[PDB]
């Protein structure tokens, strides 16, 4: 059975990483799955329905690699966009 | 759609969930922002033998606790996940 003692930060940092990114129109969804003492994440951004989808990518792409970067106890971080007309 | 009581409502959740009686941990938390609202699915690890009537009861002490403290939560859902340390 997973530990889940980090889940609170995990959820909390990647969240905060997400919703003040470039391009990000407000955050869909957020789910957090304990395996071992870590966090499997996967994060949903809404972005603008005719942004270029080289360019959505770049979004998505630069927030994984930030999540990555700063947040302890993350194991494997997947980033989905959800378009929006605007 | 502005997403900004997300942190609360997943740190909350996820505290009343894994101090709850028959609760080995969280597996998985999901939220999702929805109007003004956030959907929320959690789902716990119990004692694989506990009885269905039991488990059924802790699903619900917990979804009932949840919306009775967390504010901008709607259509909270609590699942089971079975595990036999035996």
Do not use: C, W
């Amino acid at each position: 059975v997973p530990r889940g003692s980090h889940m609170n930060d995990v959820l909390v940092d990647a969240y905060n990483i997400a919703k003040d990114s470039q391009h990000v129109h407000g955050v869909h969804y957020i789910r957090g799955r304990n395996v071992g003492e870590d966090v499997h994440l996967d994060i949903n951004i809404y972005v603008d329905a005719d942004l270029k989808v080289f360019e959505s990518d770049l979004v998505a792409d630069a927030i994984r690699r930030k999540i990555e970067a700063e947040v302890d106890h993350v194991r494997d971080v997947h980033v989905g966009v959800t378009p929006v007309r605007i």
